[PDB]
Design a protein around this nucleic acid. Structure first.
Ligand code: NA
Ligand code: NA
Length: 321
DNA sequence: CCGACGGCGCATCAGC
DNA sequence: GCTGATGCGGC
DNA sequence: GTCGG
């Protein structure tokens, strides 16, 4: 049904980027999604409305797509110079809906236009602009392994006692990634515990020209850009990388959460509820009889998390659902 | 019929 | 100058 | 825009 899920996703983005209606953005995603995983060529909009998250207005949109191969509102909005430009510019990392709009108000509508107006961009947006196309490229697993090597090596070299895990879908065995998400902890850093801990790891990864730019950086979260060293060969794209410092006693919660997937964490947070628990990125708590959660139970490996909700450890390899 | 639809870090703005 | 709000990213 | 209370 690619005709329909593209439509729905195209519609999704205009809501986010142009109407600034976050909830309609998601409404449309949920429907793309449910339809994307639905094992039949959809014959009518009535057929589709059965699926949860497909309601009346989308049902009519299907019906118009199916009969005519388009949507009047969609064609119409694609040709709108203002709107289609506001939508496009938000593709630059650091330009969201508010800033894309303000730009288009003053005539800034293309990358070119941003290029001639560097002075009206903030740090984040220059970097987004500069790597506009690298940022939209995927990363092969191979390159990810090559990147993992560099990070794990360099972290251990700052302090042998650090623990770093690369999570995301890559940890789940995914053939390609969108960025690198690194979770970093250290025994001297607990919920009750230097401002140097994240800084020293970033410092090292810059020293060896692995980290090339900085989107933002604090005591507990770094977001920026990285690049494998070029092998006589054509150089590697610049890649998004984030790095987070988590307290040693919340790491394995972090690791699980930042491993996903979504569809996984839903079921697990709905099973945790069944066997009576509440499980966030930081902690698991045992809810009371009215619904008053008490003490976050300790966690010391990915293993634990499962014992507490009574489950057989699922390997990251198959955590799609 | 009408409110929920998520939280949090950091950079940067708006208000005192 | 300080605090708190808002934009953003993207889980 | 959809759902559900
Ligand atoms: Na975007
Ligand atoms: Na953007």
């Amino acid at each position: 049904n690619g005709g329909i899920t593209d439509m729905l996703t195209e519609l999704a983005n205009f809501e986010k980027n142009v109407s600034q209606a976050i909830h309609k953005y998601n409404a449309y995603r949920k429907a793309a999604s449910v339809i994307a995983k639905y094992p039949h060529k959809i014959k009518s909009g009535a057929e589709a409305k059965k699926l949860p998250g497909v309601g009346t207005k989308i049902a009519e949109k299907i019906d118009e797509f199916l009969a005519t191969g388009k949507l009047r509102k969609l064609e119409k909005i694609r040709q709108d110079d203002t709107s289609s430009s506001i939508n496009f510019l938000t593709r630059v990392s650091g330009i969201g809906p508010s800033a894309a709009r303000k730009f288009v108000d003053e005539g800034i509508k293309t990358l070119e236009d941003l290029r001639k107006n560097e002075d009206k961009l903030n740090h984040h947006q220059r970097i987004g602009l500069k790597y506009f196309g690298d940022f939209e490229k995927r990363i092969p697993r191979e390159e990810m392994l090559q990147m993992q090597d560099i990070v794990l090596n360099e972290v251990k070299k700052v302090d042998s006692e650090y623990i770093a895990t690369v999570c995301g879908s890559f940890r789940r065995g995914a053939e390609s990634s969108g960025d690198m998400d690194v979770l970093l902890t250290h025994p001297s850093f607990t919920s009750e515990s230097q401002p140097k801990l994240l800084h020293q790891v970033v410092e090292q990864l810059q020293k060896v020209h692995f980290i090339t730019d900085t989107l933002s950086k604090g005591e507990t979260k770094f977001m920026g850009v990285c690049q494998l060293p070029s092998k006589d060969e054509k150089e590697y794209p610049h890649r998004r990388i984030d790095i987070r410092l988590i307290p040693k006693d919340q790491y394995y919660c972090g690791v699980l959460y930042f491993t996903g997937s979504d569809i996984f964490n839903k079921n697990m947070r709905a099973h945790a509820l069944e066997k009576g628990f509440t499980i966030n990125e930081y902690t698991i708590r045992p809810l009371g009889v009215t619904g008053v959660a008490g003490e976050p139970l300790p966690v010391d490996s990915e293993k634990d998390i499962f014992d507490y909700i009574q489950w057989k450890y699922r390997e990251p390899k198959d955590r799609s659902e």
